[PDB]
């Protein structure tokens, strides 16, 4: 009993299976390039704000450190990833001691 508009809209058809195209996969971690970047964090060093952010992240505040990232990196969807990947680098040192 199909219908014009609602939850089950319009013409019900068969959803043909298909492989995803090759440009749809643009940003997987691709381990060799992961090795290049994780080689380069410990030779090139860290950004001057994040060397200040990780002395904020542990003892000054825990919320204000993201708001400190929220103003220097663009938005809140870009500020959570920077906040939690520092807290893993700062967990890759603190817990490997």
């Amino acid at each position: 009993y199909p219908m014009a508009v609602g939850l089950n809209k319009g013409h019900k058809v068969t959803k043909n299976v298909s492989k995803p195209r090759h440009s749809r996969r643009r940003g997987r971690l691709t381990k060799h390039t992961k090795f290049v970047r994780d080689m380069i964090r410990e030779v090139c060093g860290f950004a001057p704000y994040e060397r200040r952010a990780m002395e904020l992240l542990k003892v000054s505040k825990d919320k204000r450190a993201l708001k400190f990232i929220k103003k220097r990196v663009g938005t809140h969807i870009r500020a959570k990833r920077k906040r939690e990947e520092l807290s893993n680098v700062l967990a890759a040192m603190r817990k490997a001691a």
């Binding site: 009993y1 199909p2 219908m3 014009a4 508009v5 809209k9 319009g10 013409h11």
Partner: protein, 147 residues
Amino acid sequence: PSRLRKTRKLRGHVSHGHGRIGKHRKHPGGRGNAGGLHHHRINFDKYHPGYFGKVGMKHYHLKRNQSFCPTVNLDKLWTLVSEQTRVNAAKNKTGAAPIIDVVRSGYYKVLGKGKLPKQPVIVKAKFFSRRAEEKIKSVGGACVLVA
């Protein structure tokens, strides 16, 4: 055609049809819709009530494809088909009912209107008004929705 018009007819009369006194100059009352608020107020109104201000909500980038519902009301419904059938589907045997789908004719909605004749009908449309389908379910007809 320059013969039939007035500037041959009014060639010799000195003021040429615009007064000795007003003596039509260039733009006496402002150009275009000038002064709809102030001095052409009585003329902007009475003849255009509603002209000044907001009335509704904005809809940024409306697309003229999704408000698209061309509407047949039932008195144009038998003339989508060949009339060779509506006499044929009226032969006294049974409920030999033909389909009449408006969506292969360019219509999406069946609106109500009285005076449908007494043959049994099935109608494929995407939208029905509740006056319209009771005008079909009273002639022994059915109302099959599809999209």
